[PDB]
Symmetry: C5
Subunit: 333 residues, 5 copies
């Protein structure tokens, strides 16, 4: 029997190796396989990865006439001591079990142990949509021991920044992923003490042009169309009102559609400011004509060319819109 080469019954595996002395160093190697999905309403992302652990345990040493290693399946995990890593700030996770448990153990003759497994984890990530759609989001994934403090277990990356590998085909439907790097930081819990924590960081960016076209182009086009009505003669009363009254309806439909398409984030964003300012510029154009029409009628009654209001509007409106655009794109870059 292979398990008889390891003195399983002659050793206690309920305690850590090197009990009562210096901590046992444990190395971790992570390989990212894919990114499944990201949810903006609930602010979470899903990841699939390979997790590996390295440590040395002298109780598992077995004699041999060569350097061949022995491979065991997941059934040996319950009989020996293994590190209990867990993911912080996670919502749910599981280990794949098709067609059997995806757990592997490899033991060297001296006693070096390799522990590999495949896991899928969902983690939280705080997001800020103030600068939508020009926003940049940074998320992270954290790994930490559960029950052992730094006095008993010393956790670290095995090969520095070479311990993180990513698949060549990792991609998202609506985001750009870049800048994968690893950091470490000590965390404190008042109940037990100090712990070591490992981080995996990355950054997300959007496709600016798609939002630019769809949102901003119709708004500017409709504003210019509303401007155009200033060059039509005032005497054609049933030929100037329809343009102004039919620009507002189109703007309202555009706003409703854009609101429907965007994610349900309930606070003011950068896109909302642009759309509601443009709505006022269209609204004021109709108010301008009512004043012109009213003043003309008063003169006719009193007494019985181009009005100066139109001349001033043709210059004032484009300047105001250009100044607003300059300020808006200077603030939001």
């Amino acid at each position: 029997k292979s398990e008889q080469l390891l003195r399983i019954d002659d050793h206690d595996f309920s305690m850590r190796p090197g009990f009562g002395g210096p901590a046992i160093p444990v190395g971790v190697d992570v390989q990212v396989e894919s990114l499944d999905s990201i949810s903006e309403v609930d602010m979470d992302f899903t990841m699939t990865l390979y997790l590996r652990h390295y440590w040395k345990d002298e109780r598992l040493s077995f004699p041999s006439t060569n350097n061949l290693s022995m491979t065991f399946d997941g059934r040996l995990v319950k009989k020996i001591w293994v590190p209990d890593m867990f993911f912080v700030h996670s919502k749910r996770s599981f280990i794949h079990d098709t067609t059997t448990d995806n757990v592997m153990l490899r033991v060297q003759p001296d006693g070096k142990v390799l522990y590999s497994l495949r896991v899928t984890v969902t983690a939280m990530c705080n997001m800020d949509f103030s600068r939508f759609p020009l926003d940049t989001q940074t998320c992270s994934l954290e790994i930490e021991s559960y029950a052992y403090t730094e006095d008993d277990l010393m956790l670290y990356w095995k090969k520095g920044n070479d311990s993180l590998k990513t698949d060549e085909r990792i991609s998202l439907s609506q985001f750009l992923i870049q800048e994968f790097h690893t950091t470490t930081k000590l965390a404190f819990y008042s109940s037990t003490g100090w712990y070591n924590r490992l981080y995996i960081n990355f950054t997300l960016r959007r496709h600016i042009f798609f939002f630019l076209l769809q949102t901003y182009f119709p708004a500017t086009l409709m504003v210019m169309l509303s401007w155009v009505s200033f060059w039509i003669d005032r005497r054609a009363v049933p030929a100037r009102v329809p343009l102004g009254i039919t620009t507002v309806l189109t703007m309202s439909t555009i706003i409703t559609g854009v609101n429907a398409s965007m994610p349900r984030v309930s606070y003011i964003k950068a896109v909302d400011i642009y759309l509601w300012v443009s709505f006022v510029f269209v609204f004021l154009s109709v108010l301008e004509y009512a004043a012109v029409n009213y003043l003309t009628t008063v003169q006719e009654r009193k007494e019985q060319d181009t009005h100066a209001i139109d001349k001033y509007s043709r210059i004032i409106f484009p300047a105001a819109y250009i100044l607003f655009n300059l300020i808006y794109w200077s603030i939001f870059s």
Copy 2:
């Protein structure tokens, strides 16, 4: 074997410590990790937290030459007695088990025991939307023993108010969370007797301005645009009907969009009252012009400036709208 130091087979662990005498005091410490999501239609929320228990049992005392404690994993839980806490008025819950069970046991030489575990719980919370979007919601989370009454298990907060801790980065997409505090109360069941119950309370608020702009601003703008038609000469018949008839369509589209965007709660809210009153004001303007056009025509037939009705309307309509706004915002603050 570390389990041989504790006389597991020399004691019965089917009964609480100190059976037949005074109840064993059990303290609870809770640290909130995050709020996952909140549902308005189903009226529930999801929370992730750490749960810790403190109690003393002399049967677990073991001799030692120093003050060191022994740490055990989740496999020892089934061999000893632990309190059976559960969350009242919950819909679903589970304990995280990646990469293994998130259960820790720590035993002091004197006999003090620490039992910590990590759990996610979904709980119900009644909500009132009569004052939407100016509503305030209060939700609570409750903990209680299942099978032991107050005569057997005395449940209390270990450090009073200081037993609750919260994360620094806990937030919600569409709500503001504040006022975390803890209270206790006795609960009675006719079948078995009295129980001790613990509470965790918090309050939720919305972002007023986002709803204010989106909902209220277009309605007021359309009402003013409808008022504008009172200043146009009545002789321009195909230049005054379009304004009135195209304000109604815009108002209807705005109402439909707002209803679509809001949650599907089927009773009258504070927002719905405002929108449907404004619709009537737009509707009454159209009828007013129909009366003027009819009366003016009758004069032409009988016989073969500005009409009094328009002069009165110009003053009557804004005063009524201002009075309605004052009363509405006085009632709903």
Copy 3:
């Protein structure tokens, strides 16, 4: 050991108590904790409740010097005989297991047993939406034994009508719940025979006014607005067609929005009759003006005031609409 006081190994627990003789009566108590959600498309509802069983077993009697009882957790269930209740016409159900199994057992010295557990169940309920939104629905939940007929197990409510208790804070978002009561009935299966079945009944209602306002108010307003066009002089040709042609579009958008907001039930409902009848009234108003315009044009050519059609329409249309409203509200109450 507590399990040694009960002669577990001296009795056979694969057979019911009193085997070979009269049936064992079992009492049932139910307390409804909350109603989670209801689905109209799939016609089912979710409930959380407490289930309690009472029966007498002489094999569990143990001597004592007093009248104290012993409380056991769920690990003893597998060693004794317990009734196998199940829910009829259910879709899915489970027993909560946080932080451990929610099962309690209490045994009296004489031999009376109490078996309580906490369960969440989803059950089906047929619904009829012919009279929406004036419909009333009756749903029920049924409890029955699985393998034992009435010859072996006699199931009944322990305290008659007083065996059902409901929480004070049970409510639904879009329905009103009332009239909780319990009944019993015999059922027959050809495979084994008769069974006793228990019922829990309740009724549901809607908020009439919310649907009334939203659906019916705009339709009536648009119909009256279409009527208003009869009082405009026929000579204002480009001032009367737009009103009629713009009422149809508003009515169509209202109908589309109503259909969108409604649940996806694909057969004729009461509200659909009202809306599509009003669409005919709006459609006929446009055709009425076309007949007037054509006849006027014929006279002008032939030869080279208020037309009778308008005068008759002003009286005919409101009377027909009032008659339709009276009949419709008499049929559907």
Copy 4:
């Protein structure tokens, strides 16, 4: 002990009864409890039913002084041999386990065995939407042994057609269900050989009138409304363009709403053909007027009643639409 009457340890239960000789005949009875839901996009349905098996085993015979039978729960299944039935072309299935396993075993003294259990299954069913909403779908559910061929296990319906029973209150929200019947057929697998397969067949139909009204009524109404414009004098130029240009908008909105409400099936259906042909008729009415206006204008310049085009159109358009309707309803019945 009840299990000691049956010589469990004296027989090998890893082999089928009558091993080495003729196959054991197994009968099947099915009772349908309810139909849960149907998914048109994924083309599958969910059903709940009772499954019963009948077979004879001499190894389970026990002596008795009477003819009473012994009933066991699911804990005896793991010690004896039972048929390994499974559902073909299924996606997911499970057995209900509240408050315990819904498995029953009954043994007659001679050796007859009954095996009943309650199971919920989701199965695939290909659908064709070419003739929507006048389409008819046929679905089926199949039962077959997994490991035993026809040489070792012979499967058949116990009571012919009378083996299928349906609940009185089975129905669907949007479909009509009828024609339940059962058939059998042999299946071949090259890896192992021949197998027996059992079928349960039914047919589905829709509500024609709900779709008829909703879709077809507005399209015909708008087409007739567009026809109406042919009777208005050509000189009323700003009274004839609006009708034609506002009918196209209503038609487009109706088409968009209908497409949104219907299921997302991405190929041409019978309803789509009717709506787009009606869109062409409304479109051509606008072009017809432009030709009339241009030709009249041509004469005015050259030189300086009712045009023939209107007279011919008034007859040509209705005849073409009637012919299209006749052909369409002849092809699609």
Copy 5:
């Protein structure tokens, strides 16, 4: 006992057959049963298939007087050595267990073993929608051993290309599936070494005409309708503005509907280019009329037929649109 024919306790089954020698060849057969669904947002697909293994082990050889084989259920898998296959780049998977585990084991007298099981797997597939709706997508499913390298386990298709079978009725609601074939390739991991991988490839196509009609046809029709306005006399000022202003609204509604119906892929597709270029053509037609009306008024004031702009537009606009169509359909084929 059947398990006593195989010397289970006389051999160690924690090591592969022929340990220390040449690699053991394992053959694989796959039969595809159905394709459940496909998700374009998350870029994945679900498949149900049969998996079969072939290998030879002398330790399972048993004496016999004939060539009959013994069939075992899933309970024997835990006692012998079986290959640990797993699916690469998968998100979730499970093995069906109704009414029991769908695992079959067959052993020949000489020692040949057959291992079949039924599994459902969800796998990722990268998609590119740059050419929507005329895109072509290729997906694959990959199988690989987990813990054994090529030095110990050699994986291959048993009968080459003939080892893949597909059901006769496999189809998708909105895709066309074709070109099933199999390949092999070696993969390298730096942790352990080379591995063998197996592939299953297929291709998906859409229904061109459904998207063609719905999207493209209304855009072309509206562009031609906007072209129509060039043939109407300029003096009919309130007879051309409504047409131009009502084409833009229809185009906007069509674009909004198309955006709503399409999957939420956030980058520019081939469909978006066509719709927004057409929207510009409609916009320019309105501005063209503004120049005509302005210049005409200038002449009347200064001084106190068909303008050249219309004459040039009648030829310029259709030619530009035809050139754009030719280029667009040349680039995107």
